[PDB]
């Protein structure tokens, strides 16, 4: 294979410093702080904030007044989840 053939002649594949399991801890952290702490963990100590009260800001960011989310929350929930599902098959089927 390419596993040792290259490695015959002095073509070596050095291990990436960060194991994949570590990469998955970062992308857990970044994803753990994004969910709980909003965006503040990039600017300093993470600040726990209710996730539904996070998304009220991220609408103010795009100009949609937060009263949309507090009223549409249940709907927005399903649209989110059903959107995540198709990401599987988008990857899974192609």
């Amino acid at each position: 294979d390419l596993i040792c053939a290259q490695k015959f002649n002095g073509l070596t594949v050095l291990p990436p410093l960060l194991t994949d399991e570590m990469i998955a801890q970062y992308t857990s952290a970044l994803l753990a702080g994004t969910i709980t702490s909003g965006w503040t963990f990039g600017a300093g100590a993470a600040l726990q904030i209710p996730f539904a009260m996070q998304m009220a800001y991220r609408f103010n960011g795009i100009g949609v007044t937060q009263n949309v989310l507090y009223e549409n929350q249940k709907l927005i929930a399903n649209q989110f989840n059903s959107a995540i599902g198709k990401i599987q098959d988008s990857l899974s089927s192609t």
């Binding site: 390419l2 053939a5 015959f8 070596t12």
Partner: protein, 90 residues
């Protein structure tokens, strides 16, 4: 000359020459064949002429020595890393 198994050996089989680590291998040759080969046109696996058996060829391991040291300021002590070997050939 007597065959060497699980030990770095120079070799010649039927005029084919190289240097590797000869092992028992389960890849299965059709009768008339001689060599095996890998993707890279290396000689990967050969069959012992006198006693038909499928012998891998893995050339003896090698790797970059890496000298791990704190600054020579703090110490003269080094910890050497032999890259990508089993720990025997030390």
């Amino acid at each position: 000359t007597n065959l060497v198994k699980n030990k770095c050996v120079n070799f010649n089989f039927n005029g084919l020459t190289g240097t590797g680590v000869l092992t028992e291998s389960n890849k299965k040759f059709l009768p008339f064949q001689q060599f095996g080969r890998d993707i890279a046109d290396t000689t990967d696996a050969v069959r012992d002429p006198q006693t038909l058996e499928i012998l891998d060829i893995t050339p003896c391991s090698f790797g970059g020595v890496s000298v791990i040291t704190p600054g020579t300021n703090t110490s003269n002590q080094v910890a050497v890393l032999y890259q990508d070997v089993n720990c025997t050939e030390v």
